[PDB]
Amino acid sequence: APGDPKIAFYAGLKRQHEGYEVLKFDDVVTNLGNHYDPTTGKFTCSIPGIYFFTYHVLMRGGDGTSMWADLCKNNQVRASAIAQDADQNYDYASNSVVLHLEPGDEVYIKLDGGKAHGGNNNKYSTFSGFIIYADA
Amino acid sequence: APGDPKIAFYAGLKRQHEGYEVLKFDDVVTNLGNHYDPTTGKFTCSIPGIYFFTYHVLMRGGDGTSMWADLCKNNQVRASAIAQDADQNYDYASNSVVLHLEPGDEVYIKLDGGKAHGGNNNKYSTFSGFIIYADA
Amino acid sequence: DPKIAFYAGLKRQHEGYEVLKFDDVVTNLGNHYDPTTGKFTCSIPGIYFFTYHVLMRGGDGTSMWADLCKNNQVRASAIAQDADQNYDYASNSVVLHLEPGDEVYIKLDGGKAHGGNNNKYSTFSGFIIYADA
Numbered sequence: 001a002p003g004d005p006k007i008a009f010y011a012g013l014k015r016q017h018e019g020y021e022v023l024k025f026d027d028v029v030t031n032l033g034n035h036y037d038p039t040t041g042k043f044t045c046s047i048p049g050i051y052f053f054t055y056h057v058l059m060r061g062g063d064g065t066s067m068w069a070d071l072c073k074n075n076q077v078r079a080s081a082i083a084q085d086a087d088q089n090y091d092y093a094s095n096s097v098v099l100h101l102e103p104g105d106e107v108y109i110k111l112d113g114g115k116a117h118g119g120n121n122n123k124y125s126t127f128s129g130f131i132i133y134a135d136a
Numbered sequence: 137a138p139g140d141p142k143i144a145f146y147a148g149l150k151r152q153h154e155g156y157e158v159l160k161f162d163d164v165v166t167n168l169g170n171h172y173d174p175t176t177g178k179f180t181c182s183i184p185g186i187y188f189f190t191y192h193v194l195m196r197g198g199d200g201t202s203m204w205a206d207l208c209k210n211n212q213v214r215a216s217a218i219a220q221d222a223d224q225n226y227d228y229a230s231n232s233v234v235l236h237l238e239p240g241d242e243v244y245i246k247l248d249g250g251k252a253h254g255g256n257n258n259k260y261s262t263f264s265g266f267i268i269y270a271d272a
Numbered sequence: 273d274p275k276i277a278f279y280a281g282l283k284r285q286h287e288g289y290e291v292l293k294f295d296d297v298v299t300n301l302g303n304h305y306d307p308t309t310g311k312f313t314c315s316i317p318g319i320y321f322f323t324y325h326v327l328m329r330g331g332d333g334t335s336m337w338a339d340l341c342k343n344n345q346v347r348a349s350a351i352a353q354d355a356d357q358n359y360d361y362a363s364n365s366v367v368l369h370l371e372p373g374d375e376v377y378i379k380l381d382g383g384k385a386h387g388g389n390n391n392k393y394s395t396f397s398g399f400i401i402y403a404d405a
């Protein structure tokens with residue numbers, strides 16, 4: 001309908017990450033409005049409203065048994081997940097959120113311990129989201 | 137647009153909970169329209185339409201047996217997620233659905249073979265969903 | 273506002289490099305998903321969400337790969353793995369711009385996918401988020 005904002009993004013992870021750092025998904029497939037920045041890993045809200053996000057982060061198979069990944073809004077964790085495998089086999093840390101955001105809010109995925117697989121261009125580890133409703 | 141139904145929720149889980157009747161996600165982050173009730177663990181439809189739901193449940197079961205988390209619509213399973221590990225008690229059970237619902241329908245998560253854990257921040261086990269289209 | 277959305281589960285075992293034919297169809301608004309091919313075919317330009325959750329078969333192998341493809345190109349990859357040949361899932365999600373005729377589907381890239389019968393363990397769903405003009 002006229003006036004509905006179109007805001008959506010989807011990016012994969014080319015480079016491996018470990019420890020406690022923000023995941024800079026840099027294989028950008030969709031980025032309507034350029035509100036996702038692959039140089040920072042952050043989606044920045046431009047319109048107050050209700051947003052969906054999801055993430056799938058592949059643990060570094062063959063090199064460790066656990067890896068944690070959090071979805072953050074500004075300075076707060078809003079979703080958490082753990083990948084774990086006693087044989088160091090591949091496993092995912094994945095979760096999804098629905099959040100109200102205000103302009104300037106940042107949403108991003110941060111590692112919270114362990115090692116993440118670096119996918120080159122294969123998009124094994126991903127971050128995506130979109131606006132569901134704009135506030136009146 | 138203004139006037140169109142805005143219905144969306146997201147909830148985590150405080151501490152560890154059995155869910156063999158219903159898993160009552162009780163850390164409610166988003167509940168636009170208040171169609172999710174943390175005291176019953178159910179999302180109740182009030183508008184005919186198409187709805188998305190997803191869940192990510194961190195479960196702990198007995199050594200070496202399968203466990204599962206089912207998304208139910210009324211008395212029917214509409215998705216399931218199964219996990220089994222040889223000597224790892226904690227694993228995720230996650231799935232996603234798109235469902236047509238009528239007023240009165242109840243959508244919720246039920247567990248078997250293990251207990252759900254919210255982790256320290258309540259955000260490791262989650263349930264979310266929203267209306268995609270309203271029947272008109 | 274166009275209404276296009278689907279959701280289906282995998283009844284039968286698949287293996288190797290074949291397309292996954294999710295044939296336990298729960299939702300298929302607009303009839304744009306074909307359970308006999310496993311493919312969603314775009315009918316109007318726009319922005320679409322898809323997600324999949326594919327269960328690896330137990331007791332016959334330790335790895336399985338399942339990739340979401342757009343036309344003949346991988347747009348998301350996933351691996352399931354369990355060294356004791358127990359279950360594991362290969363899952364991912366995407367947001368894609370599509371044009372009419374574009375096909376979106378899940379294809380194996382090695383390994384065996386569990387045939388769930390009516391259990392809806394292994395799933396594929398999607399919907400249009402915004403239509404183009």
Ligand SMILES: [Ca+2]
Pocket residue numbers: 054096190232323365
């Ligand atoms: Ca999802």
Ligand SMILES: [Cl-]
Pocket residue numbers: 121
């Ligand atoms: Cl590419």
Ligand code: NA
Pocket residue numbers: 016017018021
């Ligand atoms: Na690093």
Ligand code: NA
Pocket residue numbers: 217230231325326361362363
């Ligand atoms: Na899954």
